[PDB]
């Protein structure tokens, strides 16, 4: 996370961080159920029994001997997926055991597509940087589709992808190792609802280009179908 402060212990407790050993891979991700994490199809290589994935759970300080690591069994990554630019950027990974952590619910109408947005993660906090230490955090605000192609030229699946962050200057954003984790905010009961997963962009923080996320919404009836299974 680029322009974020750390986060306090015990502040967004669904966060897990996934190192995907198989293909030497950081990303974060969010405790869907306690023993299934939501996290981006791109930083899986496919469905199936997987044991190759530990999540970190409990913890802001990923060097912590309070932290709870679990390894996967299975992955469900968005069917015909192929790649983060063409959309269908989400992935289940049923764990061997549960994270002991609140979950995060995640959106399943477009009511809460909008407004300022919270990200968090333990990837770089500059291009290029290393990865953190202690879980960074920070507020984006919803970019429209619109607002995102004029600055950036990217091509969005509009349905399937939502824009944030600061396009007029840049400085806030996530960045590489923050992949996966989830874009979230308060609904009207006042509790954390998922709108997000950390999807793609272009470099990070930079001005004209706002960080694209998983438009969760869209997809919540087929994660939740496919959770089902798990
Ligand atoms: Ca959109």
Known sequence: ????????????????????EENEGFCGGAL???????????CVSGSGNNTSITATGGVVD?????????????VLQAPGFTKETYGKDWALIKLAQPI??????????????????????????????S?????????????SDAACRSSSSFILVANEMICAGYPDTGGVDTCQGDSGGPMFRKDNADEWIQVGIVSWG????????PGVYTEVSTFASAIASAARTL
């Not at 995640?106 to 940087?129: D, H, K, S």
């Not at 990865?131 to 970019?143: C, G």
Request: glycine share 10%.
């Open 131 to 143: 990865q953190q230490r202690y879980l960074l955090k920070a507020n984006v605000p919803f970019v």
């Open 1 to 20: 996370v680029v322009g974020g402060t750390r986060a306090a212990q015990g502040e967004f407790p669904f966060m897990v961080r996934l190192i995907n």
């Open 62 to 74: 990923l060097q912590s001997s309070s932290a709870v690591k679990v390894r996967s069994t299975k």
């Open 100 to 129: 002991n952590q609140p979950t995060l619910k995640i959106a399943t109408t477009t009511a809460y597509n909008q407004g300022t947005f919270t990200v968090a993660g333990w990837g770089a906090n500059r291009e290029g940087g």
């Open 32 to 42: 869907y159920a306690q023993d299934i994490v939501l996290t981006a199809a791109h």
């Open 202 to 209: 272009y470099g990070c923080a930079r001005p004209g280009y």
